[PDB]
């Protein structure tokens, strides 16, 4: 699912509404990013039959 990662990160937030019970326990999304160690990253390339589709680098990636 998604064009990107099907990963979402959620942090449990408490907010009041006035439609239902007051003070509800809910999830507000908090930003998800990625990492990777240096050897591990070269490993990610090794399994793929590509490098990556995007990295927001030069002329070519940036448009994609």
């Amino acid at each position: 699912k998604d064009l990107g990662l099907p990963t979402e990160a959620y942090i449990s937030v408490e907010e009041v509404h006035d439609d239902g019970t007051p003070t509800s326990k809910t999830f507000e999304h908090v930003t998800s990013e990625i990492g990777a160690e240096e050897a591990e990253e070269v490993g990610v390339e090794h399994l793929l039959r590509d490098i990556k589709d995007t990295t927001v680098g030069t002329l070519s990636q940036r448009i994609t």
């Binding site: 006035d18 019970t21 007051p22 003070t23």
Partner: protein
Amino acid sequence: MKDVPAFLQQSQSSGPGQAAVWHRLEELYTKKLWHQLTLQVLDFVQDPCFAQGDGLIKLYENFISEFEHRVNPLSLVEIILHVVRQMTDPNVALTFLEKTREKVKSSDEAVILCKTAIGALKLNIGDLQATKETIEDVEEMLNNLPGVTSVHSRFYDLSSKYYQTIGNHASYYKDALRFLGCVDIKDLPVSEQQERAFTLGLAGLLGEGVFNFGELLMHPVLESLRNTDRQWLIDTLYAFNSGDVDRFQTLKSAWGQQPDLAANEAQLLRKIQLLCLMEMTFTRPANHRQLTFEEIAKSAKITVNKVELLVMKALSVGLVRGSIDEVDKRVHMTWVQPRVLDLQQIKGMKDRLELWCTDVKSMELLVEHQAQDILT
């Protein structure tokens, strides 16, 4: 073991009706079904022992020392609680409560129950400051649970009584709204519900920043119940919100009923005017953004110097955002406050968004053809 069966034994002999209650209570403990006693005890306090009999004070000691484990903690506060309501001596009632407080084993609803009762006693003496603190403590505990249940209902009744009498309209609104809104059923009488709804409506008019007018209409307490006094009431909620000055003035007699509105007029006059700047912009703007300055003064009907104050006061409280431009004599709004819960609010949004949905898809495909080479 037996604090409670010891007293029960003297008492059961002589007295018809009442003898029976004691006889049943005694047998449960002896066979040692402690739970079964907990089923019996609740009624017993309301039946003999200062409500058919006497020696409730004797019984108050007996329950607390031993019976705090044996008999359910929640039931322990509850048996005394009922007596505290009927009594005309809050000075003795408050001490019994300070002592009752359970925390014996695991989680207890027992703590919250004292907090309403203690608070109610203080208001009756006229310890105003002391009632206010007891409201802050009962609120915090409750709010922590994401739910609303019978003790939660109680909190809302105490908060509202204290607040209406001194006249803190702002402080009254939040509690009163929430009670209406979650649709409380407990054991509430019709008369008590007429009081909640009525006062909340007076309170909004005085208020600052309060645009909770629409949801009130939806809610059962106001909507289901009506009377002759309410016929003024309903109409003032509209007059104030939309900005028709004339309609409110005539309906003013209503202020008289409940003492929530007798504190000020100072903010009251400003507020209808504030509401009209938010309301008017919310209707005509939604992809337009201007409304003329000119309508505000026509929905004010008061002196010119006073208009600048009202207009600026509305940006500040959080009813609206934007700027006012008086070299075009128009009001530009960057933001217009979202309309408090209705079926209508949801409908307005859906159509506009669908129009936008069509723009993204088309534009996306278009741009993709060209710079086909750059993609690779």
